[PDB]
Amino acid sequence: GVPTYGAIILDETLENVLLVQGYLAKSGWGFPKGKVNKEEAPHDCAAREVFEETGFDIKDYICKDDYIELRINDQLARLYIIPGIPKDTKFNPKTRREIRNIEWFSIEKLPCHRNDMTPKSKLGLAPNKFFMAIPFIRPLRDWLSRRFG
Numbered sequence: 001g002v003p004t005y006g007a008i009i010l011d012e013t014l015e016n017v018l019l020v021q022g023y024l025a026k027s028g029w030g031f032p033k034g035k036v037n038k039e040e041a042p043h044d045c046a047a048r049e050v051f052e053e054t055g056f057d058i059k060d061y062i063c064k065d066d067y068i069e070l071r072i073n074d075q076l077a078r079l080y081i082i083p084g085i086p087k088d089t090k091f092n093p094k095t096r097r098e099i100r101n102i103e104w105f106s107i108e109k110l111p112c113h114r115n116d117m118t119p120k121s122k123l124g125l126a127p128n129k130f131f132m133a134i135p136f137i138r139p140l141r142d143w144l145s146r147r148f149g
């Protein structure tokens with residue numbers, strides 16, 4: 001799988017994270033990110049994908065060692081952590097053919113796992129519009145505790 005890079009943008013209070021909503025298979029909410037191009041450095045892919053999806057240029061704010069990286073089904077996804085971005089920032093994707101909406105979400109209200117269906121004696125997980133974000137939420141909360149407290 002081709003690695004993906006993007007960002008976890010937080011506001012000044014550290015309460016809220018910026019999520020984007022795509023279409024079709026990407027219909028739920030997730031962190032802005034996308035596939036690395038041949039020869040492209042991880043930091044440049046993160047900035048490009050984030051700029052394409054949100055209109056916000058993170059290049060001056062990325063810190064090389066501040067990221068969360070997960071391997072999901074043998075694909076690497078690395079999100080650089082970008083705090084302190086004002087909640088009144090105007091975010092506008094480049095092409096609304098890929099991004100439906102861009103919103104701030106409260107970190108403490110976001111799920112960090114999907115719910116089962118043990119009420120129905122059925123296996124699996126209930127659908128959740130935050131499916132793509134969920135795997136990063138607990139590591140992000142733990143990372144913010146370690147880095148800030």
Ligand SMILES: O=C(NCc1ccc(F)cc1)c1cnn2c1OCCC2
Nearest residue numbers: 020021022025026027028029030132
């Ligand atoms: O990434 C996702 N959503 C956020 C997004 C939307 C548009 C975009 F351009 C970038 C990020 C997403 C949701 N569901 N799936 C996703 O991607 C993997 C397959 C299933």
